[PDB]
Amino acid sequence: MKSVVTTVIAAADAAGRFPSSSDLESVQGSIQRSAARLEAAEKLAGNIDAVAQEAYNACIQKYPYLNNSGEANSTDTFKAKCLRDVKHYMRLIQYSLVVGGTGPLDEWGIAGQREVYRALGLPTAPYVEALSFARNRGCAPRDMSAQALTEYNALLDYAINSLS
Amino acid sequence: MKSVVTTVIAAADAAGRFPSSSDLESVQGSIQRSAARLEAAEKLAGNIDAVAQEAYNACIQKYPYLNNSGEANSTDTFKAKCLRDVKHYMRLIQYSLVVGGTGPLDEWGIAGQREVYRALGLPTAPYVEALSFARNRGCAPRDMSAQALTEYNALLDYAINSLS
Amino acid sequence: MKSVVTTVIAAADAAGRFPSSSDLESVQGSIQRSAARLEAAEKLAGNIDAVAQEAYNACIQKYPYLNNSGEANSTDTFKAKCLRDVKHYMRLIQYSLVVGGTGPLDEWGIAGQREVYRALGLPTAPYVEALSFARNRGCAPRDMSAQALTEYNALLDYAINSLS
Amino acid sequence: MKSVVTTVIAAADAAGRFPSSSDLESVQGSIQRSAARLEAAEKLAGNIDAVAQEAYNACIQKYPYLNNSGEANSTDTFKAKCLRDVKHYMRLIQYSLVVGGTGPLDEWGIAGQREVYRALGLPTAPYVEALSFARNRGCAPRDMSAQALTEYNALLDYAINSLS
Amino acid sequence: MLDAFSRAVVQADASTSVVADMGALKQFIAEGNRRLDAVNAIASNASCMVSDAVAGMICENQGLIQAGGNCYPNRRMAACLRDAEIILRYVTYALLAGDASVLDDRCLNGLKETYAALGVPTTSTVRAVQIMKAQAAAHIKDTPSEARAGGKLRKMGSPVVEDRCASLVAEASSYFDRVISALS
Amino acid sequence: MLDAFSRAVVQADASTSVVADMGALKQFIAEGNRRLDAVNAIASNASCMVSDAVAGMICENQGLIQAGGNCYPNRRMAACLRDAEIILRYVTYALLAGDASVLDDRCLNGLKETYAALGVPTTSTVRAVQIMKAQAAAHIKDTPSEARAGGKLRKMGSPVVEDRCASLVAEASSYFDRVISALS
Amino acid sequence: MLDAFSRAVVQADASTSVVADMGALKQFIAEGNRRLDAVNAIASNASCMVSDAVAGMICENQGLIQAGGNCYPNRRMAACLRDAEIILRYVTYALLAGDASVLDDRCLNGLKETYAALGVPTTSTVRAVQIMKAQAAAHIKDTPSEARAGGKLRKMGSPVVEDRCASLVAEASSYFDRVISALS
Amino acid sequence: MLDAFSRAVVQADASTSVVADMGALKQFIAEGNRRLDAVNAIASNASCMVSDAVAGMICENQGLIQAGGNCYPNRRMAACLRDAEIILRYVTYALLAGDASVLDDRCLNGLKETYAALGVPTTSTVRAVQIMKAQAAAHIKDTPSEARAGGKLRKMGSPVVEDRCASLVAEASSYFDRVISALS
Ligand SMILES: *C(=C)C1=C(C)[C@@H](Cc2[nH]c(/C=C3N=C(/C=C4\NC(=O)[C@H](C)[C@H]4[C@@H](*)C)C(C)=C\3CCC(=O)O)c(CCC(=O)O)c2C)NC1=O
Ligand SMILES: *C(=C)C1=C(C)[C@@H](Cc2[nH]c(/C=C3N=C(/C=C4\NC(=O)[C@H](C)[C@H]4[C@@H](*)C)C(C)=C\3CCC(=O)O)c(CCC(=O)O)c2C)NC1=O
Ligand SMILES: *C(=C)C1=C(C)[C@@H](Cc2[nH]c(/C=C3N=C(/C=C4\NC(=O)[C@H](C)[C@H]4[C@@H](*)C)C(C)=C\3CCC(=O)O)c(CCC(=O)O)c2C)NC1=O
Ligand SMILES: *C(=C)C1=C(C)[C@@H](Cc2[nH]c(/C=C3N=C(/C=C4\NC(=O)[C@H](C)[C@H]4[C@@H](*)C)C(C)=C\3CCC(=O)O)c(CCC(=O)O)c2C)NC1=O
Ligand SMILES: *[C@@H](C)[C@H]1/C(=C/C2=NC(=C\c3[nH]c(C[C@H]4NC(=O)C(C=C)=C4C)c(C)c3CCC(=O)O)/C(CCC(=O)O)=C2C)NC(=O)[C@@H]1C
Ligand SMILES: *[C@@H](C)[C@H]1/C(=C/C2=NC(=C\c3[nH]c(C[C@H]4NC(=O)C(C=C)=C4C)c(C)c3CCC(=O)O)/C(CCC(=O)O)=C2C)NC(=O)[C@@H]1C
Ligand SMILES: *[C@@H](C)[C@H]1/C(=C/C2=NC(=C\c3[nH]c(C[C@H]4NC(=O)C(C=C)=C4C)c(C)c3CCC(=O)O)/C(CCC(=O)O)=C2C)NC(=O)[C@@H]1C
Ligand SMILES: *[C@@H](C)[C@H]1/C(=C/C2=NC(=C\c3[nH]c(C[C@H]4NC(=O)C(C=C)=C4C)c(C)c3CCC(=O)O)/C(CCC(=O)O)=C2C)NC(=O)[C@@H]1C
Ligand SMILES: *[C@H](C)[C@H]1/C(=C/C2=NC(=C\c3[nH]c(C[C@H]4NC(=O)C(C=C)=C4C)c(C)c3CCC(=O)O)/C(CCC(=O)O)=C2C)NC(=O)[C@@H]1C
Ligand SMILES: *[C@H](C)[C@H]1/C(=C/C2=NC(=C\c3[nH]c(C[C@H]4NC(=O)C(C=C)=C4C)c(C)c3CCC(=O)O)/C(CCC(=O)O)=C2C)NC(=O)[C@@H]1C
Ligand SMILES: *[C@H](C)[C@H]1/C(=C/C2=NC(=C\c3[nH]c(C[C@H]4NC(=O)C(C=C)=C4C)c(C)c3CCC(=O)O)/C(CCC(=O)O)=C2C)NC(=O)[C@@H]1C
Ligand SMILES: *[C@H](C)[C@H]1/C(=C/C2=NC(=C\c3[nH]c(C[C@H]4NC(=O)C(C=C)=C4C)c(C)c3CCC(=O)O)/C(CCC(=O)O)=C2C)NC(=O)[C@@H]1C
Ligand SMILES: *[C@H](C)[C@H]1/C(=C/C2=NC(=C\c3[nH]c(C[C@H]4NC(=O)C(C=C)=C4C)c(C)c3CCC(=O)O)/C(CCC(=O)O)=C2C)NC(=O)[C@@H]1C
Ligand SMILES: O=P([O-])([O-])O
Ligand SMILES: O=P([O-])([O-])O
Ligand SMILES: O=P([O-])([O-])O
Ligand SMILES: O=P([O-])([O-])O
Ligand SMILES: O=P([O-])([O-])O
Ligand SMILES: O=P([O-])([O-])O
Ligand SMILES: O=P([O-])([O-])O
Ligand SMILES: O=P([O-])([O-])O
Ligand code: NA
Ligand code: NA
Ligand code: NA
Ligand code: NA
Ligand code: NA
């Protein structure tokens, strides 16, 4: 699971090395940046339902054709799954804020996503719009500090890039 | 050359990734730890000759047989080389403090050292003793701060471990 | 284990060949040379303790610093182990004379030697001097035939090379 | 070209080794066996036309159908080429006795032989009979010493095996 | 690869000397947070940048999307998009490291010869890289325009200073210039 | 591999729930400098630890260096020294990460079976590990004795607290105990 | 692989002792020329031996060359011929070395399982190996019969002794028995 | 690779003729024991030769061990020691075979071009090979000097003849000259 520490351990192990000076220095970066990313993680842990609900609503507002017969937001099951999927991305962003690398999002969100959505005929633009809404929505210090918001926004952009 | 940033870049490149959260976080560690290691680097840059001279002196005091006819410190040229060698290690330590990883020591000191010393009949114990003397010599706050001295000592132990 | 016959069998097997002319001819060389090397092996078998003792004694005479507190010949246990080690190399030489290839010395003496002596901070120069003494000591016809002595000396020089 | 010495060199090179005891011992086998094989080589060099002629005559005696219309010994050009081919094998045997390994026979006779004879519709049994006649013909000490004859016969059987 | 600090060490080693000027190195550290922001600004906008740059290259040279053109058929368009991303990726590594060596060594060396053997057109390659250079400068300054953003505008929200990180803009632009230099 | 933070994530993902407990995470961060000192204390002393542990295993069990012993001949001694280093290396990774997964996955899984196929004696392996555990504890606490240091004593110079990093000593010891459990 | 001499050294090494008793070893040297003749006798006749042995196996069991038989169709007959030759080749290596290790390590290990998975019949394989054992005995003694030679008789012309190399015949035979036992 | 005898066979095959001149080949055989002594003389002293030669090359050119020198830093010194040993190894193979083919084919072909691309200096490589040539000549003749032996003198003890193996010294020296000519 990609984080600061697992990246440097994997590099050390590939070379048969004990942890050395740059490995310790890297982990000091986690000590320093952790406050911002855990602040965002805590915000998101407390308010993920509302955050996901509004992002979902925004993507349907953008693309009302999804409500038409045969389309991906058209049935009660579909509506529930689409909201659930937005919440899954947010949860994986919460995890990635906890870890301080993209591992959770990479392994549990991104890997396979394109194949799944192609198979099920799910368009990617609504996913992008939900995440895009969420990315443009936050402001500091209203919602969280400026650096917490930097961390949150970076993970949303990471997700957006993976679907673009 | 191994450092915080080249390690993360190499890991990113192997996976076809742009820099991501854990890469930036790792580099913040360099921002943080730099003061300590650069303090040590400055001290060593300003006093390298005296530091090497006393460490060299200590290894010959330990192993006076090196002066006896035929041995590795017994002539003027040999004497000069041995002191020079001790200074090379301390210069590579200075470089490693600047870089924040062991790259300079690895690439320009450690690689090949055992084969060179073997071929030339040069015993490794006196190298270890010079570095050991240097490792036990420093104290804080006299010579530098406690964390500068931690950086300095860790690289000396890195070099000692390479020869042990 | 490397010998005349295992070398030619390995080469034949790699090519899917029965033994052929050059394989048989190689083994004729063992029939011819065995007299010299087995003579040396029998001499060494019958006098190994004295031969190793004088080699050990020579290496300590060259390096009296080994007797000093904290050095590798400084305790009764260490003195016994050093003599033992010299005897191990002579025993492996005896085995190599029996086999007619360097297999026993390569597999049971040389492989790992550098790593062992490094880890224990044992200097290699005393091993080299013991073997060197042994190499320069014999003369023919006093000790054995001139071709026997050639065989014995060649294996001592093979061991010296491995440590040099 | 496979010989005693090239086999041990190739094995030493694959392992990054200088020549060692078993390599020298193998070559002493060539010093010893060379008398036998160079005796056979000398006799064959001096009498190759007669040796080849009678072997060729024997193979046609065994297979007179080869003289019939359309068969492989039925024209003057075919007759000349068949005898020439018998002589080629005997010359390669002569070379193999000189080298002390099968290299010249392997590379210049055996390699490709089955493809060539198949393409031209040439039966192998007459080749085998020529070599078989040659193999059963010699006697010692009339033609050469018993050990020279053993070398000659072994290469003839090596050639027969390659065609059987 | 090297970084800005090992680059200084290589220069010192040329005269078997200690690194004595702590000044420029302490400047790298002082601007370290800005440098992280600059990298974030590019990486965070990379898909948009690549797509827009390749599209721009094409709208300025329609021959690329007609028979015989090097972004025709779909396979070639795809390969071009991939390359523009690769290039931007290695530029971003150079900016994180504060040194061009990873870009030079892992992306640029052999690129001219590779493209010449394939018939990838230099003129158009240059334009794609120029557009990415301009995009990168705007994102580092956090001044992208609505006019160029095609409904996809992003603001980074870093602490603003009057020069808008001019030295980092210049450095980033120098790396894009190295890409272009490597084609001739 | 996992680390202490991704461990919490995997536990939460098992119930597709957010990570709610920030306090435990913040405690990891608060002891981060002491953790880095603990790792530095082992890594810095690793050659001395390994050699002393293997030598101690041998002085307590002379069978290992006598005929048919598993540290005879040189090749076997060298393999053993290498193994003790490998085990210490993966224990130190586990301590840096705050999680045993790298040690389980990359070192311990399959190792008991590998050793049974080679005949590497379990009681001696365990003893080498026990010695390394005791060394690690003393170096983390920065209280090695002269009596065990063989004239090679090192002082770390970390800032002293009354408990001398008891929690990290217990955690490091737990990783050595995991090795012992897996291999016996 | 080991040879007769290295086998003796492995014995001595088990007690960390010099090789003192050299009588058996000096006998190997005194019988070395006859061992080379024994090897030459088998290698020189190997194609005849293999073909005759597989043909004998078959003439004693026509099921092998009928529907469902393990030497039917041509590819199976060819594979059988190839195997008999492989086996004979490794037996000759064992005889040259004076030690079965090459044969056990490089030929016999896993052979039973291989044949089981393929359905190669043990009874028939054993008979082929038994025929080759008899052939090799007669060629080592240099007493093949015209009756069994099918117009292809060869005489080796080695110097005759009363026992006709009984010791080497027994040793060769033991290697063939080892092949058979590996299928038991 | 070829040896002295297969070289003669290649020459004979160029006119599809038997090898008739047995004399030069019977001279090879007569000098075989001295050839094995000559190879033993070099192989047995190889470490001392290589280290002394490379040290000699350096003491005559101190530029090699200064900044920018091709034996600086440790890695380059090691690579150079490795190469001198490789070269000597291949020369010794050629002397054992009595033919340069192994040396030309496996060591010298492409070597000058390899060194040019790396910037390995020619004059210095030649010097190291010159010193090894001179050492080899002394060891073959069994007349090394105390002056040059640095307290590591070895005597071979081979049976002395008045010419001290003049033909083999010329031959060995010719192989070293081949190396030097290939690198010049
Ligand atoms: C074809 C008709 C054609 C185009 C396609 C387009 C290409 C083009 N783009 C620019 C400049 C920029 N594009 C930017 C991209 C983005 N901004 C964002 O906010 C999102 C994240 C992203 C993707 C849309 C940016 C930042 C710029 C920089 C300038 C600015 O922001 O104002 C150019 C100009 C390049 C140059 O200066 O040489 C071009 C040509 N133009 C077309 O004609
Ligand atoms: C054989 C006669 C034999 C030994 C060899 C020795 C092995 C042994 N070692 C310990 C404990 C420690 N060894 C330590 C090592 C070092 N300390 C240093 O300062 C340097 C860097 C390094 C290498 C020498 C350390 C730190 C300890 C911890 C205890 C302490 O410091 O006081 C033990 C005890 C292990 C246990 O408690 O189970 C043993 C057995 N002893 C021998 O008998
Ligand atoms: C099928 C009708 C059938 C056979 C085919 C044949 C098989 C068989 N062969 C032997 C014994 C030997 N065969 C030998 C082979 C050869 N002798 C030579 O001179 C040439 C070079 C070579 C190939 C033809 C030899 C040497 C023997 C040994 C005995 C001897 O020489 O007298 C046997 C007997 C096996 C046994 O004893 O168990 C068999 C069965 N027999 C068939 O029925
Ligand atoms: C540096 C100032 C410097 C040197 C280092 C040295 C290099 C050098 N060495 C020789 C000649 C030989 N060296 C030999 C080596 C050995 N002899 C032994 O007995 C042992 C086993 C071995 C290792 C020490 C030998 C055999 C010679 C041959 C000459 C001799 O024996 O007298 C030379 C001379 C090369 C030549 O003749 O062209 C040089 C330059 N000299 C330095 O100045
Ligand atoms: C040009 C690049 C920008 C700009 C950037 C500035 N950033 C400044 C401060 C700052 N940035 C960060 C985030 C950065 N550090 C990290 O550790 C990580 C990720 C791990 C990132 C992305 C931090 C933490 C800080 C310091 C805190 C703060 O000041 O709020 C900054 C001010 C300091 C300086 O002058 O260098 C600037 C100028 N500014 C601009 O005007 C353009 C748009
Ligand atoms: C048990 C491990 C020790 C012990 C350790 C303590 N270390 C404390 C502080 C500290 N350590 C470092 C160095 C560390 N941080 C890094 O970034 C790097 C390398 C990149 C390393 C090696 C720093 C920077 C600090 C903080 C500065 C300081 O306090 O001086 C520390 C105090 C904080 C705390 O209570 O956690 C402790 C206790 N202490 C002991 O008693 C044993 C010997
Ligand atoms: C059972 C195997 C035989 C038999 C064999 C004997 N061979 C004897 C002597 C002998 N054989 C060779 C040839 C051999 N040596 C080589 O170097 C090579 C190839 C490179 C081969 C093939 C030599 C040189 C000699 C020695 C000279 C001589 O004796 O003429 C031999 C006599 C010595 C002894 O008793 O061991 C025997 C008995 N004898 C038999 O009766 C069966 C058929
Ligand atoms: C120049 C190279 C020397 C020198 C050499 C001579 N060696 C002579 C004889 C000889 N050497 C050996 C050992 C050799 N044969 C082997 O089988 C093996 C290893 C397997 C080796 C190392 C033997 C067995 C013999 C024959 C026994 C003997 O003569 O004592 C030799 C004399 C014969 C000849 O003239 O060719 C010479 C001259 N002599 C010199 O002056 C320089 C130093
Ligand atoms: C800065 C003043 C902005 C801006 C911000 C507004 N946000 C408003 C409501 C709102 N925002 C969110 C997302 C936020 N909550 C979280 O928990 C997280 C992340 C974990 C984020 C980023 C939510 C769920 C809500 C609704 C609940 C709430 O009021 O907090 C808001 C109120 C009016 C509105 O809903 O638009 C404002 C004003 N508004 C701006 O125009 C500037 C650019
Ligand atoms: C703490 C008070 C120690 C202690 C320290 C002493 N060190 C003394 C001299 C000394 N130390 C060094 C090494 C130091 N200089 C550097 O530039 C660097 C690293 C870059 C280090 C680690 C040198 C070269 C010297 C000699 C020059 C000088 O005096 O500064 C020293 C003076 C007396 C002496 O030489 O021993 C002391 C007192 N002494 C102690 O007793 C505690 C444990
Ligand atoms: C001092 C603690 C020793 C000692 C040392 C001597 N070293 C000798 C030669 C030598 N040293 C090195 C390593 C050095 N060169 C580098 O480029 C670097 C790192 C960048 C280092 C650390 C090399 C490569 C060499 C060989 C080339 C040369 O001569 O410079 C030396 C001369 C040995 C000889 O010529 O026979 C000595 C005496 N002497 C002592 O007593 C202790 C063991
Ligand atoms: C040739 C005349 C030499 C020389 C030789 C001397 N050796 C003496 C004693 C001696 N040598 C050995 C080693 C020898 N014994 C073995 O078993 C083996 C190999 C297996 C070898 C090489 C031993 C153990 C001894 C002591 C017992 C004994 O006397 O045999 C010796 C006696 C005086 C002395 O001890 O130095 C001589 C004269 N001396 C020379 O000066 C020329 C060059
Ligand atoms: C042993 C006494 C045999 C036997 C042998 C005879 N061979 C006869 C003639 C003959 N043999 C060869 C082949 C021979 N010459 C060579 O140069 C070489 C190898 C290089 C070999 C193996 C030739 C070419 C000839 C014809 C020329 C000649 O007379 O030498 C021979 C004469 C009568 C005949 O032609 O058969 C005999 C007696 N004869 C026997 O009865 C026993 C079993
Ligand atoms: O993984 P993906 O499916 O390619 O997104
Ligand atoms: O690299 P090294 O030589 O092994 O130290
Ligand atoms: O094996 P080594 O350790 O390299 O001697
Ligand atoms: O090579 P070959 O054709 O198979 O004979
Ligand atoms: O590491 P690099 O060489 O830069 O790729
Ligand atoms: O990464 P991993 O799977 O833990 O080894
Ligand atoms: O060599 P080997 O192990 O017998 O196969
Ligand atoms: O074998 P070779 O071809 O000479 O490498
Ligand atoms: Na993308
Ligand atoms: Na070490
Ligand atoms: Na060596
Ligand atoms: Na065949
Ligand atoms: Na267990």
Side-chain angles (χ1 to χ4, degrees), chain C residues 160-164, chain H residues 47 85:
Chain C
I160 290 164
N161 267 321
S162 79
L163 288 156
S164 296
Chain H
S47 299
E85 176 183 22

Side-chain angles (χ1 to χ4, degrees), chain F residues 27-163:
Chain F
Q27 180 51 211
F28 278 109
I29 298 303
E31 301 223 319
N33 287 311
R34 55 170 82 183
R35 184 178 295 275
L36 298 179
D37 280 326
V39 171
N40 185 39
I42 300 173
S44 294
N45 297 299
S47 294
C48 198
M49 288 170 65
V50 166
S51 57
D52 180 60
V54 171
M57 178 194 67
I58 292 168
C59 72
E60 296 179 4
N61 183 0
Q62 296 280 278
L64 292 163
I65 52 166
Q66 294 168 355
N70 202 243
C71 283
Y72 171 86
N74 263 332
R75 186 191 61 77
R76 289 203 180 80
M77 182 75 187
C80 179
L81 287 160
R82 181 203 69 186
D83 283 14
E85 181 185 11
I86 288 166
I87 293 167
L88 188 60
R89 179 166 57 88
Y90 282 106
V91 168
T92 214
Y93 296 163
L95 191 61
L96 185 61
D99 194 87
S101 57
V102 64
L103 170 64
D104 286 352
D105 297 348
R106 303 193 180 193
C107 189
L108 298 179
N109 291 354
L111 187 52
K112 184 172 175 182
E113 294 77 13
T114 294
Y115 280 157
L118 292 162
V120 171
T122 62
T123 52
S124 302
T125 295
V126 163
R127 184 57 177 149
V129 179
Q130 287 174 346
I131 297 170
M132 292 192 294
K133 176 184 162 197
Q135 297 166 336
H139 279 309
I140 295 165
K141 293 186 291 182
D142 205 19
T143 62
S145 71
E146 283 291 358
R148 294 294 196 185
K152 291 169 81 193
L153 180 103
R154 299 288 175 207
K155 297 313 309 308
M156 305 313 297
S158 52
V160 172
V161 289
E162 199 216 287
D163 73 12

Side-chain angles (χ1 to χ4, degrees), chain D residues 40 43-44 47 50-51 54 134 137-140 142-144 149 152:
Chain D
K43 190 70 179 300
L44 185 48
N47 205 26
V51 166
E54 59 171 20
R137 180 60 158 156
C139 71
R142 182 193 191 275
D143 300 319
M144 63 188 78
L149 186 63
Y152 182 76

Side-chain angles (χ1 to χ4, degrees), chain H residues 12-127:
Chain H
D13 180 71
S15 64
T16 47
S17 286
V18 298
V19 175
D21 186 14
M22 295 272 139
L25 294 172
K26 286 177 62 139
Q27 191 57 22
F28 232 80
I29 299 300
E31 302 215 334
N33 278 321
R34 50 170 85 181
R35 182 179 296 280
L36 300 179
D37 281 328
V39 171
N40 184 43
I42 299 172
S44 294
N45 296 301
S47 299
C48 203
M49 288 168 71
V50 166
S51 63
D52 183 65
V54 169
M57 167 196 73
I58 291 164
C59 72
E60 295 182 12
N61 187 3
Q62 295 288 99
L64 297 167
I65 52 162
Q66 300 163 347
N70 207 244
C71 289
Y72 174 88
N74 260 332
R75 187 186 61 76
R76 285 205 180 85
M77 181 76 188
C80 178
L81 293 153
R82 182 202 69 194
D83 285 8
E85 176 183 22
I86 290 168
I87 290 165
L88 187 58
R89 183 160 59 81
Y90 285 105
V91 165
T92 308
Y93 295 162
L95 192 54
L96 185 58
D99 192 88
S101 61
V102 68
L103 166 67
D104 290 349
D105 295 350
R106 302 198 178 191
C107 184
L108 301 180
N109 297 337
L111 187 56
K112 178 175 180 184
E113 292 80 11
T114 293
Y115 281 157
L118 298 162
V120 175
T122 66
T123 57
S124 304
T125 301
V126 164
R127 191 63 185 132

Side-chain angles (χ1 to χ4, degrees), chain B residues 72-73 78 81-82 84-85 88 108 120 122 127, chain H residues 72-74:
Chain B
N73 198 60
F78 280 5
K81 292 188 175 179
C82 185
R84 175 205 70 177
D85 282 10
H88 278 314
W108 300 340
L120 295 176
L122 297 174
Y127 289 90
Chain H
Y72 174 88
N74 260 332

Side-chain angles (χ1 to χ4, degrees), chain B residues 63 65 71 118 124 163-164, chain C residues 63 65 71 118 124 163-164:
Chain B
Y63 300 116
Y65 81 94
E71 302 296 330
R118 178 60 48 232
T124 56
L163 286 163
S164 298
Chain C
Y63 298 109
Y65 84 87
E71 305 294 329
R118 183 52 50 226
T124 56
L163 288 156
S164 296

